[PDB]
Design an enzyme around this catalytic site. Structure first.
Site, PDB file in Angstrom:
ATOM      1  N   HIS A 131      27.200 -35.744 -35.809  1.00 20.70           N
ATOM      2  CA  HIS A 131      26.106 -35.447 -36.622  1.00 20.70           C
ATOM      3  C   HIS A 131      26.517 -34.778 -37.922  1.00 20.70           C
ATOM      4  CE1 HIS A 131      26.079 -31.297 -34.450  1.00 20.70           C
ATOM      5  NE2 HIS A 131      26.084 -30.858 -35.781  1.00 20.70           N
ATOM      6  N   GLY A 136      27.114 -24.211 -38.936  1.00 25.06           N
ATOM      7  CA  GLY A 136      28.525 -24.264 -39.540  1.00 25.06           C
ATOM      8  C   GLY A 136      29.544 -24.182 -38.246  1.00 25.06           C
ATOM      9  N   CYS A 143      29.413 -25.903 -35.364  1.00 23.73           N
ATOM     10  CA  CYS A 143      29.328 -27.133 -34.568  1.00 23.73           C
ATOM     11  C   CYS A 143      30.828 -27.655 -34.854  1.00 23.73           C
ATOM     12  CB  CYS A 143      28.599 -28.297 -35.080  1.00 23.73           C
ATOM     13  SG  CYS A 143      26.776 -27.720 -35.153  1.00 23.73           S
TER      14      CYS A 143
HETATM   15  C1  LIG Z   1      26.371 -27.379 -36.658  1.00 26.33           C
HETATM   16  O1  LIG Z   1      27.478 -26.703 -37.365  1.00 26.33           O
HETATM   17  C2  LIG Z   1      25.105 -27.530 -37.442  1.00 26.33           C
HETATM   18  C3  LIG Z   1      23.958 -27.686 -36.876  1.00 26.33           C
HETATM   19  C4  LIG Z   1      22.797 -27.562 -37.404  1.00 26.33           C
HETATM   20  C5  LIG Z   1      22.573 -27.209 -38.803  1.00 26.33           C
HETATM   21  C6  LIG Z   1      23.718 -27.282 -39.611  1.00 26.33           C
HETATM   22  N1  LIG Z   1      23.852 -27.097 -40.842  1.00 26.33           N
HETATM   23  C7  LIG Z   1      25.400 -26.899 -41.177  1.00 26.33           C
HETATM   24  C8  LIG Z   1      26.002 -27.242 -39.952  1.00 26.33           C
HETATM   25  C9  LIG Z   1      25.164 -27.090 -38.889  1.00 26.33           C
END
Ligand SMILES: *C(=O)c1cccc2[nH]ccc12
Ligand SMILES: *C(=O)c1cccc2[nH]ccc12
Lengths: 304, 304
Positions: free
Chosen positions: A41, A143, A145
């Site tokens: 994603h 951020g 993720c």
């Molecule tokens: C993950 O890091 C993530 C999930 C949802 C929304 C978002 N914006 C930037 C990074 C993310």
């Protein structure tokens, strides 16, 4: 003595964290050998997340669109591929800090440490359990993720989790390092409700053994029970059914303390039926289920 | 979202851990620049610990008696000195993994991470608070002495604790990195009882703010209180008196949530007077006091 929710030392994993940016999205990646693993994603905008066609979105991306930075140095991307819900970015340099590693898919009830990261930089480390409904109760902000879950056996890091998302209920969902989600979750911003969060019975029993080993014994009673009788009570309290495999796994703890597994089950049964009566066990006022029998032995023996 | 008892990433500290042996005693040391810091009780036998004369015991020790091993390589000891309750072993090699560091003496109520070690090898990392009675509730077995407590500010490691002992009550005592014990404790195996373990009120309030930020709001009530009224209740429940300095430190959390500090004190007052009624806050059935207001802001903003 003393018993704490302890995470593995995070150093081996810290040396693997990198920042991955694609377009306006920045998240974390895991750099192992010459491959950087990250959630697919990263190629999505917040708008794309409603109904993303990852194959179609990925066609518009070339190697030069994935910006991979390790500390302050830029890694050169020479290939990219999607494996399930993760992207594998082949880079021209092997990570010199690559530890001995494995990718493992854990079972519900198993624990692991999480190195929460932002912009490829570590913020903290904490211990988690994969819940029976395949969610984790973590601490992740936007951020985070691409932050990973792992276990360490002497010098080998077994990566088991990569963070992908937060459900509207505040719990977390992610994949193993092959990009397969734990549970029925999908990398889409849709109605994804988690099922029943049952308690990990074998872990509660292991933690009761840790309590006895570390001096907390008030909950020990004069009773015993059977697997079937205990399980009737466990059903009533949304506890996972206890199996003979679980009893066998608690064998070393039963041997060390001299308390038979079914006697400890009878203590647990009384604790479920009567509560704590304002008392605590290992500094907790609820029955802790995020320590496996392996964690209890490891911590009580000082394995490094 | 989600709120966890999070420790700092331990990598910078992992690179400083070494094993120190003197005679038959092996514990951990902290290698920073060309000095290895360790508890002075490394020179004692279990028998010496009853009434040790450290100056007299140290006279019988030469540089070659302190065996310092970093991983599998032996460090050459070219000097030794006792500073308070720690030994400083000058080695001929500066630790190449030495991070930017400071030695700080923390106040009661402040938190830090502990890297538990055995034989110079890290076993795990967990978050602690220096209790108001100057003990810590850790997880330390024999051989863990010399394991350190620290905080990290971007790239600077502030060492604040070195583990020395366990009191007969199962709680832990140690020194700062100048070798001065926290509290009245001495490195002697004698009757050392800890005083009242009071609750760190400002930390409980900070954790209540974290709960509101992360969605748990059932405990918010229609009431307010005053510092003096709240403190009468805090006295009754062995909570530390709340000061205007504490209120000021909670200012940013009060601003973010829109809940005035004294209104949160009234929620805390009702929680002390009526209990949780079988409910939980941030997955806990008791009022958590090992998160400072700084920890709550740090974790809720994702500082790396
Ligand atoms: C993950 O890091 C993530 C999930 C949802 C929304 C978002 N914006 C930037 C990074 C993310
Ligand atoms: C510390 O590591 C320590 C304390 C008490 C007893 C003991 N034996 C070996 C090491 C220790």
């Amino acid at each position: 003595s003393g018993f704490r929710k302890m995470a593995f030392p995070s150093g081996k994993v810290e040396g693997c964290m990198v920042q991955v940016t694609c377009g306006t999205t920045t998240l974390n990646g895991l750099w192992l050998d010459d491959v950087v693993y990250c959630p697919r994603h990263v190629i999505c905008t917040s708008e794309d997340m409603l109904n993303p066609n990852y194959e179609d979105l990925l066609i518009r991306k070339s190697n030069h669109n994935f910006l991979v930075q390790a500390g302050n140095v830029q890694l050169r991307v020479i290939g990219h591929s999607m494996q399930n819900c993760v992207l594998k970015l082949k880079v021209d340099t092997a990570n010199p800090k690559t530890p001995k590693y494995k990718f493992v898919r854990i079972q519900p009830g198993q624990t692991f440490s999480v190195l929460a990261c932002y912009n490829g930089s570590p913020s903290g480390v904490y211990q988690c359990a994969m819940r029976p409904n395949f969610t984790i109760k973590g601490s992740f902000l936007n951020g985070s993720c691409g932050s990973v879950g792992f276990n360490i056996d002497y010098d080998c890091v077994s990566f088991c989790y990569m963070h992908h998302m937060e459900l509207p209920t505040g719990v977390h969902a992610g994949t193993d390092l092959e990009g397969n989600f734990y549970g029925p979750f999908v990398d889409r911003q849709t109605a994804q409700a988690a099922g029943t969060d049952t308690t990990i019975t074998v872990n509660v029993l292991a933690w009761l053994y840790a309590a006895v080993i570390n001096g907390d014994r008030w909950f020990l009673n004069r009773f015993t029970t059977t697997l079937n009788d205990f399980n009737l009570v466990a059903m009533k309290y949304n506890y996972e059914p206890l199996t003979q495999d679980h009893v066998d796994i608690l064998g070393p703890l039963s041997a060390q303390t001299g308390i038979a597994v079914l006697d400890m089950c009878a203590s647990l049964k009384e604790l479920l039926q009567n509560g704590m009566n304002g008392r605590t066990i290992l500094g907790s006022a609820l029955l802790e289920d995020e320590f496996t029998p392996f964690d209890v032995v490891r911590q009580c023996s000082g394995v490094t």
